[PDB]
């Protein structure tokens, strides 16, 4: 099918638009990385809306698109990330200048890096859990009132017409 | 904060803090796996379509 | 000579009006229609302009005088030149008005060409 | 109100300003110091408010006005010219900048010359110069343009040579007088050629029918010269003399003995910008000219390099600012040679605002130093002029084009649209690159030497400005009005530059029509840049970074902190490397 | 159809004059997408600060998508960005494919960028 | 007096010529209208 | 004179006005700017009166009074210019002189034209009379 | 550094460039006098020269050649993508 | 600069303060405004302006630009 054809093109044109200039470490990293009853669950409707947004561009408005997409990150997370980077750089500078490389300091650096990665993962999860979920639930309620749960159920159905997703209208 | 293109040109592109919707956890199991595969193919096909349409559309509006 | 200079001044003022009234997105084409040719028709040799002297032969002077006289004959038969380009007595004004009225009646009752 | 949009009040307010200035000049005995100050302040404030209202309409919306005051003079047999004003985007761009800088310079000029015997004369001369420049940029025909050209030269001859009791200043004024006479000759000959060709003096009409005379020639005694070439040659010559390009620049450094408000007006917009205005006023003519295509980038780049390097070696503050102005005039010439008329306006506004503010700060410093303008006799002035220090820091970081400032963008835009098809392109590009990096040197030298060096000045200044009896809430080495003027000037400059950046540099193009039909692909590299261009601009970025490191960490003298300075440099290098690694690869 | 707006309408010359489209936009192929955006901005006035700080362009988000598509295509075709970037990355593969022998023949990467 | 009575004769000639052209255009229109009415009259008979 | 622009069709302008476009038309002068209106001369009289009173006050207090004097002569000196240039037949960008406006400087042609137009009017009216009587 | 692709807008060829060549195509400055005065535009100190081929003309020719080259590059890229599709579809 | 005496007979303007400057400012400002208002009112008769947004110039209208009949 045409899908298969597209896969063949990815075998030839991928490096023209996907690959970027990388160092030796970057190249190493790239090589490493390469029930019929609803029971009152409008989360299925929310996922159906996500799928419709993914397969169609002229469906939702700007407000609905922002509701269905995660919030843009902000000063808090960016400043925490760069403050973590600065603290780690200062610690490594001190270690190199004083020749203080032992297993204890190596373990401390590893633990600090892991803790900082977890703390950087925290804010996006907090935002998605707190702010986004009520708006998504309200949008799902409005759209099940407008259309009906069966339509979103068959949308969620994985073997449904992606062509109808692309060519579907409000 | 608002126009960082100087940093992109001078020092390159840095890593970005994680930002994901985590909205696909609503479905579970084989449904979840199938929809992951469908969305992945959709993203790859979208990038390919963007590239190919960009190369084709030169004759339009002449 | 002053009349040809006036022609050039009028076309320049028309160009200024077109510039003010029409945006540049279409001014060039509209101005290229019928206006550029008239601008180039009233240039340095054809129109004396700001020069000391217009170098004309006797035939060219005769043709310019004939053009002026043609304009005069056109405007005189309608009595358009009483205060601006003429001096008639009160008695001549009534006769001129009667003549122009009769001529205007005659022209109106003719069939179209 | 629709009545205001249909019938401008700019004319009324400008006439009020002009008539108040003239009547204050004539009736100066009735008005004391305070009377002249108050009357002209009211008139100038009303004018500024009206023009500020109309600025948005003319810039964003497609509003412009053609005003005729009446038939003026007979210039040929059966021909008469009228007094015409054209308030359009090109005119308002210069006039608003001139008026804003003039308003703030006017408020500052009372605090300057605080107890001088002739403050009124200086105020009225500044008003006359501003009026002449505004009349020049608002010209509707060539005769009004010539009148403004001759007026700005005459009124600048009186701001210079303000100290009329000295023949030394008379020589400096006479130099500029002679150069202005040459400019007037060139301009008047060009106007004569234009009138002999088209038999009109209206600028707008000239801008729309000159393309019909591209294939024409004129007969000089043994030469057949293209009409566009000769007209452009004369216009460019007079513009070069007014804008102080290389060679014809020598009158400008000698113009620095004028009082510092006059220097703030003259060197920031107004006079030095006049030539640029001409290039913007008659864009099609220079678009169709081979002489302009060859001479604008070469002379502009040479002037930029020359002014930038000479400025970085100056020790007189006013001389440093004057040579910086020469360099920026060269940069503006190159930016016009780019072919993008928006970049010229952005460069004009940014440079004018920040240069005027820097002149004001330098003037306060010079007044404190008792008329000694060389910072070899300054140092440690931060505690005596703190506002000057901080405002000067802001103004210099913006003016020098340092990264992450408003002045960075005009340099970047200039380098985006540079044409590489010139025969002398290597020299032009080398000159532009060498002149671009010179801002950091003179900015750092001026700021550090005036404010944060050792005490190199006379003991009298420091010791008399620090007596115990002077400790009070009223203590200050400047005036409150000067501080307020500089603060509001900086705020208004930021607001106006941000508005213009939004109008021109946004994805949605909002600027009004520039009445030019020559369009190139320069915005593409602004909209969709490619990899090699980004790398090329990164090269200059890293050159500037190296120069900053040099000016910060170089020890030219023995000190107790030399060893610690080397240690700090090493620490900074190591920390930058580790910070880059952490920010790019892990977390 | 990147140069086409929501309803496939071609604006007349008189309409272009009436809506006072700038000559810079007029010289490009994006007039039909620019005019509806300008109209939406006209009946939805917005300050310059909000225009700078709003990625979605506020109430004009529907037309701004078409304008973005048209502007991207216009500028990239104007400066050959797609071909230049294709040749910058893996110049040997692009030369073998013969993407554009006119540009490929004279293309030379700088020495500082990985030779 | 200078404004109103001492005018360039070329300007006056141009203005009067334009007036004469306008008069002739109006006469042409009146001629067309009269011919149309007479044709109506003829067709009725 | 001619049209100087390419022709346009009536269907096209009908379509244009259906699309929401409006034909540009010069606007009449407002009352304040009109030098022939009544509000213009009311403003002039107010100016003259206040100028005289303020001149008296300035003489009493010692202020200059030559500028208040220039307002008094300025009114009749500017009424001549405002009304004088409106009478001239020269055309700026503003509006186009009509045939009747030009005929103010041709009294003979004006009188004869009015008489001929009237006579043609009775001629047309009487022909309409017979065509109705048929 | 590599030189850039700089020129006029290829969508505006009938604009700035078109008028310049149209002026030479229409030798309007040497037409007969409208009054029939036995004079032409060539009888003046400032006169038209429609066979000059100098001055800014070399710059105009260079701009036209650059625009043609950019259009050719775009067409070659489009043909390349078409060839890739028809080659991959065969398999 | 330190102040120094100026001769009484000279009508020069060094260090002059008029005590009645408020009334003089009033009586120089307001008539100036009136004169400028009259000049502006006269000049608005001869002021041009492009058509507003949403308006187009009919090429066959009398206000449209014209050519010359020879
Ligand atoms: C977010 C908002 C940020 C807002 C930032 C506002 C400004 C902040 C800085 C305030 C002080 C500015 C002083 C300016 C004058 C000056 O340099 O005097 C020489 C003066 C000499 O006096 P000194 O202390 O006797 O020097 C002997 C030793 O060198 C003494 O050595 P040390 O041990 O004291 O110094 C070590 C350490 C001390 O650490 C600190 O002082 C920390 C506090 C300041 C951190 C600033 C950022 C550092 C990282 C970047 O400093 C560094 O390691 C500096 C390295 C980074 C600067 C050089 C490379 C920069 C490349 C990229 C530039 C991109 C930005 C361009 C400009 C943007 C607009 C302003 O040197 C200093 O003041 C050095 C310290 C300040 C360095 C940072 C300056 C930032 C501004 C740009 C560079 C200057 C350009 C020229 C400006 C001229 C005036 C218009
Ligand atoms: C003979 C032998 C015996 C001789 C004995 C001695 C006596 C002399 C006899 C010979 C001379 C006879 C003269 C004569 O016949 O005069 C009647 C003659 C005939 O008038 P008309 O026939 O009734 O006019 C026909 C209609 O009334 C229609 O009139 P129109 O529409 O043609 O109007 C004429 C127009 C004629 O005036 C104009 O068209 C304008 C003239 C401007 C002159 C100032 C600029 C140049 C000054 C250079 C002077 C040296 C400066 C040195 C500096 C150092 O008048 C006005 O515009 C009046 C208002 C002027 C307002 C003030 C404008 C000041 C300049 C503003 C500059 C821009 C400011 C804004 C900046 C931008 C803001 C965004 O009168 C005139 O032409 C009017 C002259 C007005 C002179 C200016 C007065 C200004 C007062 C303040
Ligand atoms: C030694 C002391 C350590 C502790 C003190 C604090 C250290 C950290 C100092 C910075 C704290 C955070 C500041 C707030 C803003 C952070 C986010 C931001 O705007 O980033 C700017 C930009 C943002 O660009 P971006 O890559 O995040 O993407 C754009 C994202 N938006 C537009 C949403 C912000 O990022 C950078 O400048 C890139 C990293 C810069 C460092 C490059 C390598 C090192 C160079 C060293 C030169 C000296
Ligand atoms: C009709 C419309 C006409 C429009 C133009 C009108 C021009 C008037 C010019 C001013 C005349 C009076 C000048 C008095 C100067 C004076 O007292 O100086 C004191 C000082 C001397 O002060 P002093 O103390 O010795 O004397 C004061 C006492 N009096 C004057 C009574 C003796 O003079 C100088 O410094 C000499 C040089 C004066 C240069 C003045 C600056 C240029 C003026 C340009 C005016 C126009 C600018 C705007 C453009 C307008 C274009 C239309
Ligand atoms: C006097 C010298 C007269 C020389 C001959 C006439 C002018 C040139 C006619 C041929 C057309 C031409 O080449 O025009 C372009 C030229 C400007 O270009 P140019 O400076 O020659 O460029 C250097 C090239 N590497 O254009 C010019 O040089 C035009 C110069 C016009 C003004 C000459 C000086 C004033 C009049 C005397
Ligand atoms: C920016 C910062 C500007 C700071 C200005 C500070 C000075 C100032 O203008 O103060 C207001 C002034 C005070 O006047 P005062 O000090 O009382 O006068 C002493 C002389 N007898 O008071 C005034 O200026 C108003 C006094 C009357 C002015 C003239 C009024 C008639 C003319 C009005 C023209 C408009």
Automatic annotation (TrEMBL), chain A:
It comes from the Eukaryota. This is Uncharacterized protein. The lineage of its organism: Eukaryota, Sar, Alveolata, Ciliophora, Intramacronucleata.
From TrEMBL, chain G:
Keywords: Membrane, Transmembrane, Transmembrane helix. The keyword Transmembrane helix applies. The keyword Transmembrane helix applies. It comes from the Eukaryota. This is Transmembrane protein, putative. It comes from Tetrahymena thermophila (strain SB210). The chain holds residues 58 to 191 of 205 of the full protein.
TrEMBL record, chain H:
This is Uncharacterized protein.
Automatic annotation (TrEMBL), chain I:
This is Uncharacterized protein. It comes from Tetrahymena thermophila (strain SB210). The lineage of its organism: Eukaryota, Sar, Alveolata, Ciliophora, Intramacronucleata.
